[PDB]
Amino acid sequence: PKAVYLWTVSDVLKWYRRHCGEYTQYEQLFAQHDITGRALLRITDSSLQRMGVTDNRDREAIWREIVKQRLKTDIMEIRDMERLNI
Template identity: 35%
Template structure:
């Protein structure tokens, strides 16, 4: 059974917070209970650009979105971005880099939580 409730930041579903700007929910196969979302590492460049365009990091014409498209940043590459990588990509404002890295950290944590919940469900 799917558990959903609101907290101060977003909707919590099965223990995972869904915030504005989260990736599109995509089915990877038949879902036993609710929607199944692809892990960030499986996102395409289009998925990454969609996430950046909807997220709290700026408008759809932001430099982050342009850089992600220009450098073909997939989900796997997104999770590996560092401050140095962003500098080489031409993302200059340090505050923008830090904001993106915070959001990436959130994605990593969310993905790890999903994996842990899957492990617990399979026991």
């Protein structure tokens, strides 16, 4: 399971389709804005708005997926780092 910091825009769109699949109309905003993993770890609700996800409920749903992936990422990296110790 490749770490998010290493995700290409392609890995981001695969992520999006898997988790935000019901909101497929915004998928191409992530391509157009060149959202890599590194950007995905930084963007905010405001970025999503600026990118073109104007609908509040759609935006909150996407934002909830982003936060969920960030938590998953953080946990798995901690688990990985512990295996290497130190």
